[PDB]
Design a protein around this ligand. Sequence first.
Ligand SMILES: Cc1ncc(COP(=O)(O)O)c(CN[C@@H](CS)C(=O)O)c1O
Ligand SMILES: Cc1ncc(COP(=O)(O)O)c(CN[C@@H](CS)C(=O)O)c1O
Lengths: 406, 406
Amino acid sequence: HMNITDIREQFPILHQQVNGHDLVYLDSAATSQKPRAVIETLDKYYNQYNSNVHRGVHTLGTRATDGYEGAREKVRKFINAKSMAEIIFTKGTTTSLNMVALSYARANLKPGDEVVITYMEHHANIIPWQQAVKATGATLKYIPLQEDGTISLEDVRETVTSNTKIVAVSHVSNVLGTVNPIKEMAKIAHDNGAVIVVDGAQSTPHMKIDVQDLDCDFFALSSHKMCGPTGVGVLYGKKALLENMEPAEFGGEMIDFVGLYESTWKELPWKFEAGTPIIAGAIGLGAAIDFLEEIGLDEISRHEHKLAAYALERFRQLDGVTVYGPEERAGLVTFNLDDVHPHDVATVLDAEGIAVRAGHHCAQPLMKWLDVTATARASFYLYNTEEEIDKLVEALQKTKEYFTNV
Amino acid sequence: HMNITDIREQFPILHQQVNGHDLVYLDSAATSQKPRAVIETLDKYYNQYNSNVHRGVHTLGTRATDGYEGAREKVRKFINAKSMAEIIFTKGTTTSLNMVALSYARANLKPGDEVVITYMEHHANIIPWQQAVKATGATLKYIPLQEDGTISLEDVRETVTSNTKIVAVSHVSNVLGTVNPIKEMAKIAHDNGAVIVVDGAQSTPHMKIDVQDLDCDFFALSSHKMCGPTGVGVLYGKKALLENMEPAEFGGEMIDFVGLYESTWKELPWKFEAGTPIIAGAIGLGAAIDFLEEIGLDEISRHEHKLAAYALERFRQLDGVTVYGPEERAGLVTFNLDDVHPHDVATVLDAEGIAVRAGHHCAQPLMKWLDVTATARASFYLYNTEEEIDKLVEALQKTKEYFTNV
Ligand SMILES: Cc1ncc(COP(=O)(O)O)c(CN[C@@H](CS)C(=O)O)c1O
Ligand SMILES: Cc1ncc(COP(=O)(O)O)c(CN[C@@H](CS)C(=O)O)c1O
């Protein structure tokens, strides 16, 4: 089984004090921390074999290219894609989803067509569709949520129609912790003639992804949430869809022939990788994948289920605290204290060393659905512990006591 | 003055052998190497204060945000922009130019309008314009080149007309080493009612940039060519132009309000930074700027002019070698050996430890203008030396002798 002391020992940033207290980092849904294996991968790249890729074929250039494409194959295996042609390196989840909205949705929507999303989506999985339907005259529709913040398949079936061309939905909600029924929703989308776009930013770090079992048409993820470098992500798309989509960006490395007025594109995946690519970051993301696979995603999921179940229980021990979302969940808890604004909660918690996020978490329509303007969110990863949750609930208790006194 | 031994001591990657020979890295136009000051900046970020920015305002989140925006101010000062609102962090030069083609050109071109570029442009400054004119029904035009590969202002004046809306041009050619007369071309563009887009990927690393003196409307650059991390670049644009352009990507952090169907955008620069940004890479690019400014861009330019003048002289000592471009130039030499294909030249040179690039250098129309299919290119930076140029010319001599014997 996974030893949380031995795992934490690999993350230098955890071992420091904030405002005189041991750091308690509970904001991994915003971004995760890195183990030495990843940081030292970046170091070794810049110390030893940095060079541009797919260009000069001298010795360092070959090493960098092999490292970059080797990381692409690591990603392919990690999400169980059929082919490296289906694995596109991007700047992050947000850019991946925007590439689908630009190159697939804007080429495949007509008036009368529908894009169907849900009220729990992150802005990254809302605004690109708002913009694509405006540009095409198509219609945007929202699957309603059950009272506990889950999605019923009956509601999916009612909302998706024979006019739906795209269903876009999160694998895991960054606010509710809901794990959505992506595989069953893919069947519903296909049955109606639609493709499904899966926002996997919060699922990929925490649980095994098998795109062949999910049968998603597109799947987007971010390195910085899964122990990898900032600035890099992946767009997966079924090869037959990517073959028919035009590039979202144009430039070097993604062309075959350039004339004065017309150009032709490389084969996949490079068709979608204009310019010098995110070489070091992609290689470090491959290192993050090796790190997570050595621990075991199923072990990481089990650890997070234990932390989530413990946190929910201990939150129920606090009077005057509201928790949003379902009992079965990913590793995060979004909440409010009665009569204390979440920004103030976050301030007091940081004074105790505890990092959480307050605000709308880039999900304003969901806050409106919840009938709140803001919330506070503690989120967990493989380096967090029950003792840290104890510190969180103790600090919420003392926050309530403090704000009741004055 | 700058001490090249002390500068090289800071670049760990230079100190190694390739195929039994000291490495001679002459491919900095493809990508530059990094000093410890930059690599250690990334280390310190991941070891000590990684957190997402402009989101959770806990202690590490504040440190990361301050580091990210502090790097933006470093860039602003470095290119002498008036305002941080004008400094957009992107994935690289290619993405920056594509954002201009998407958000400015496609919104501002009608049939009859012209985009004017030159035959020496890199593909990154060709294809986005090809695509924008096709999408708008506008016309793409090319300023011709003089016999030495420079641009005469008379030709600029003849090509730009009152129908030109955009002139796009490189500051420095990655093939010819030409430094183009950007400031005078900006006056010509403005006189005709056009904006000028400057591709500064090869100028920014090597010479001071002052966008107020150049009066360029847009200016694009890449971190990885100027001792900075991969995966990051800058788009500069005059504030009044950026204010009127729509975002190229949509998502978190670049919104003010998100409704079900409509959203409003943040102020500049964040309007153009969708999603979690390239936090570590931007901070490391700020470190690269501090490093270069401490050495002095004018010292770096002088050093490169000495290396270029020495290389041109020594190339003229070789029989049967053709060099392309003008005598006054940036720090690079593109050439061919009579009767030896440039790919074979590059192979033999790598066997001697020497890294150069062979091919079309992402400038196919320029190769056609030069009446060649490919070339070889040695390119210099602040860690290179005359002794390395000696090794290059000696190895070209022995390449000629070898291929004449068989
Ligand atoms: C479900 C979901 N979908 C898309 C994204 C955007 O991922 P990027 O790597 O920013 O591009 C995120 C990232 N949500 C972060 C940062 S806003 C959080 O604090 O909740 C997400 O949670
Ligand atoms: C004049 C010019 N303009 C745009 C670019 C593209 O920069 P990126 O950082 O790849 O996006 C480059 C990069 N030319 C490299 C790599 S193809 C070379 O080996 O010559 C350039 O030289």
